C-alpha cells in the first residue's frame, strides 16, 4: 500500500509482527487514546481482515468491549454472500449490557446481514440454577456452535481497567492484584509473561479452545494498552493483531 | 380546531393531557414520526433530575426512539423495558426499542434477558437470578412509562399468540391492547400475556405515563383503553382523535 509506505506503517507492521511473533500485524494511523476516529479505523481494518479470511461457511465467535463494538459498527454485508453465523465466545463477564459479548454479537450480525445465536448463562447463577440451565437444549446448541468456531475476534485490555469496568468481586480483585495481572482477553487475566493468573468462570470458549480456531483476530490499540498487548503476546497465540500507532510505537520504543 | 380538539379529547378520555399532531398516520406514514417527535418533547418536559424510563416495543415507540435526542438539561436517564418480549419479533421487542432510545438519548439502559422457549425449571432459574432481579427492581421504581396502544386482534396476530389464547381474546371480545394486556370495550382486562416486570397495578405508582398511538384504525382501541382512569398523557394524531370524537 502506497499510503502505508508513505506513512511508515509498512515498516512499523513488519517490525511489530517480528517483535510479537504475530501471524500478521495491521496498524492504523494515530493514537485511539487521543483521537476517537482511530478506533473506528481499527474496526474497519479488522473487518477487512475478517472478509479476507472468511471461507464458504463461517462461525464467528466475538468478545464484547468498545473496540469489538467498533468492528461491528464498521461491518458490512459480504459481497461474496458467504454463510455467516455469529456467536459470543463466552458469557457477559460482568460487563454492563452495552459492552457484553451478546450485544456486540447481535450488532455485528445485523451489520453483516448474517445470523446470530446468543448465550444466556449468567455468572451469578446458583449451583442448582446452573444445573437446570446448562442442560437446556438452547444452551447446549449455542455451546456446541461455539465449539466449532472458525474465527475468533477479540479485544485485549489492561487488567486493572477491565477489572474496574466489570463488577469484579473483592476477592477476585485481590487475586488479580496479588498475582500482578497486566493484561486481559476474553475473561482471562494474564501476567507480564503471558501466563494466566485469574480466569473469570464462564461457559463457552476456554483458553485451550483457541488453538483449534484457524483465524484469530485481536483488535486493541491506544498507547495505554502497549504493555497489555506486549504481555498477551508473550506466548504463541497464532493471531493477527489490528492495532494503532499509539500502541505499536509505544511498545516498540 | 386543534386546541378545541385536544380539550375535548382530554375530557372524553380523562387524560392528564392530550397532544394531537396533524394528519392520519394510517394514510400518511411519516405522521408516526411526528407523533415520535412530540412524544420526545413531552418526555423532556416531564423529566426530573433523575429518571428511570420504562418503555414498550412496537413501531410507534420505535418512532419515539428514532426521534429521541440528548437532553439539553443533561438530566440523568436510565431506560428499561417495561415487560418481557411478549412474543414480538426482534424489531418490535421492548428490549430493542429500549436500547435504541437510550443510545439516541445518550442515556444508560438495562435489559430483561429472559429467553424462550425454556422449560419451566430453567425459566424460574433465570428469573430468580441476581442480574434479572436487579432489572426487575429497577422497573418497579420507574418514574416514567412510555407505551403504545394497539388493536387487540392486530397485536395478538403479530405476536405468535397460541391458538388457545387467540380464542380466549376473541371469546372475551377484547378490542384493545397495551403492555401485554388485552382489554374489552369497558377497559377491563380480559387476557394477560404472562411476562415478568411491570404489571397493570404498578402503573398507578408511575408519576408520568405517556401513551403514543394514532391512526384512524386505532380510534376504537384508544377509546376502550381509556374507559378507565389511567392518569396518562396521550400523544396521538388527528386520524385517531377526529374519528374517536366524531369530528371528521
Work out whether strand A83-88 and strand A115-116 pair parallel, antiparallel, or are unpaired: parallel
CA A35 to chain centre: 21
Fold of B1-248: Rossmann fold (3.40.50)
Phi and psi torsions of A178, nearest 5°: -55, -30
A138 contacts B126? CB cut-off 8 A? no
Give the integer Cα–Cα distance in Å for A12 and A14. Answer: 5
Q: Chain A contacts of B122, Cβ < 8 Å?
A: 132-133, 135-136
Which residue, among A73, A97, A117, A127, would best test binding to B if mutated, counting the most B CBs under 10 Å from its CB?
A97
CB A70 within 8 A of CB A153: no
Find the length of chain B.
248
Nearest C-alpha neighbor of A64 from the set A32, A107, A33: A107
Whether B74 contacts chain A with CB within 8 A: no
Closest to B88 (Cα-Cα) out of B169, B159, B182: B159
What is the CATH number assigned to the segment(s) A1-253? 3.40.50.1360
Cα distance between residue A130 and residue A187, in whole Å: 19
| DSSP helix/strand/coil, A183 | strand
Using an 8 Å Cβ cutoff, are B111 and B95 in contact? yes
Binding site of B for beta-D-fructose 1,6-bisphosphate, by residue number, is: 57-60, 83, 93, 158-159, 177, 218
Q: Do A122 and B132 touch (CB under 8 A)?
A: yes
B106 shares contact with chain A (CB less than 8 Å): no
Size of interface A-B (CB pairs under 8 A): 39
Expressed in Å, this structure's resolution amounts to 1.8
Q: How far apart are CA A218 and CA B164, in angstroms?
A: 50
| Residue of B169, B214, B162 lying closest to B190 (CA atoms) | B169
Q: 3-state class of A46 per DSSP?
A: helix
State the Cα–Cα distance between residues A14 and A217, nearest whole angstrom.
Answer: 17
What are A139's three cell numbers? Answer: 444452551
**HSE, side-chain direction, 13 A CA sphere, residue A226:** 14
**A138 close contact with B: CB closer than 8 A:** yes
The Cα–Cα gap between B184 and B174 comes to 4
Cβ separation B130–A120 shorter than 8 A: no
Q: Is A136's Cβ below 8 Å from some Cβ in B?
A: yes
Positive or negative, the CA dihedral A126, A127, A132, A136 is positive
Burial of B49 (0-12, 13-18, 19+ CB in 10 A): exposed
Q: Which of A98, A120, A124 is the closest to B113 by Cβ?
A: A120
Residues contributing to the annotated binding site of A: 64-67, 90, 100, 165-166, 184, 225
CA distance B91 to chain A (A): 11
Note the Cα B10 to chain centre separation in Å.
18
> Residue A195: CA atoms inside 13 Å, Cβ hemisphere, count?
4
Q: SS3 of A153, please?
A: strand
The experimental method behind these coordinates is X-ray
A89 close to A63: Cβ distance less than 8 angstroms: yes
A136 vs B126: CB contact, 8 Å cut-off? no
- Which H, E and C letters describe chain B, residue by residue? CHHHHHHHHHHHHCCCEEEEECCCCCCCCCHHHHHHHHHHHHHHHHCCCEEEEEECCCHHHHHHHHHCCCCCCCCEEEEEECECCCCCCHHHCHHHHHHHHHHHHCCEECCCCCCCCCCHHHHHHHHHCHHHHHHHHHHHCCCEEEECCEEHHHHHHHCCCCHHHHHHHHHCCCCEEECCEEECCCCCEEEECCCCECCHHHHHHCCEEEEECCCHHHHHHHHHHCCCCCCCEEEEEHHHHHHHHCCC
Task: Of B139, B142, B110, give the one whose Cα is nearest residue A96.
Answer: B110
Q: Where are the beta strands (DSSP E) in A111-150?
A: 115-116
For A22, other C-beta atoms within 10 Å of its C-beta total 20
The domains of chain A are located at 1-253
Q: B182 and B154 in contact (C-beta within 8 Å)?
A: no
Q: Which residues of B touch A64 (CB under 8 A)?
A: none
Q: Which residue of A has its CA nearest to B124?
A: A129
* Cα gap A101→B116, rounded to integer Å: 20
CB under 8 Å, gap of 24 or more: what pairs does B24-30 form? Answer: B24/B214, B24/B215, B24/B216, B24/B237, B24/B238, B24/B239, B24/B240, B25/B214, B25/B215, B25/B237, B25/B239, B25/B240, B26/B215, B26/B216, B26/B217, B26/B239, B27/B216, B27/B239
Amino acid at each position: 500500500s502506497n499510503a502505508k509506505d508513505v506513512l511508515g506503517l509498512t515498516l512499523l507492521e513488519k517490525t511489530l509482527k517480528e517483535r510479537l511473533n504475530l501471524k500478521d500485524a495491521i496498524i492504523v494511523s494515530g493514537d485511539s487514546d487521543q483521537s476517537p476516529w482511530v478506533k473506528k479505523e481499527m474496526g474497519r481494518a479488522a473487518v477487512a481482515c475478517m472478509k479476507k479470511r472468511f471461507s464458504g461457511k463461517n462461525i464467528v465467535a466475538v468478545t464484547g468491549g468498545t473496540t469489538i463494538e467498533a468492528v461491528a459498527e464498521m461491518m458490512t454485508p459480504d459481497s461474496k454472500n458467504r454463510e455467516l453465523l455469529f456467536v459470543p465466545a463466552r458469557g457477559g463477564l460482568g460487563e454492563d449490557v452495552k459492552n457484553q459479548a451478546n450485544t456486540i454479537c447481535a450488532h455485528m450480525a445485523e451489520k453483516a446481514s448474517g445470523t446470530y445465536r446468543l448465550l444466556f448463562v449468567p455468572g451469578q447463577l446458583s449451583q442448582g440454577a446452573y444445573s437446570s440451565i446448562i442442560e437446556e437444549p438452547s444452551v447446549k446448541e449455542v455451546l456446541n456452535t461455539i465449539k466449532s468456531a472458525s474465527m475468533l475476534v477479540h479485544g485485549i485490555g489492561e487488567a486493572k481497567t477491565m477489572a474496574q469496568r466489570r463488577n469484579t468481586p473483592l476477592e477476585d480483585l485481590k487475586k488479580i492484584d496479588d498475582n500482578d495481572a497486566v493484561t486481559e482477553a476474553f475473561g482471562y487475566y494474564f501476567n507480564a509473561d503471558g501466563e494466566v493468573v485469574h480466569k473469570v468462570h464462564s461457559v463457552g470458549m476456554q483458553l485451550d479452545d483457541i488453538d483449534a480456531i484457524p483465524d484469530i483476530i485481536a483488535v486493541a490499540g491506544g498507547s495505554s494498552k502497549a504493555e497489555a498487548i506486549e504481555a498477551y503476546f508473550k506466548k504463541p497465540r497464532n493471531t493477527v493483531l489490528v492495532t494503532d500507532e499509539g500502541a505499536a510505537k509505544k511498545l516498540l520504543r
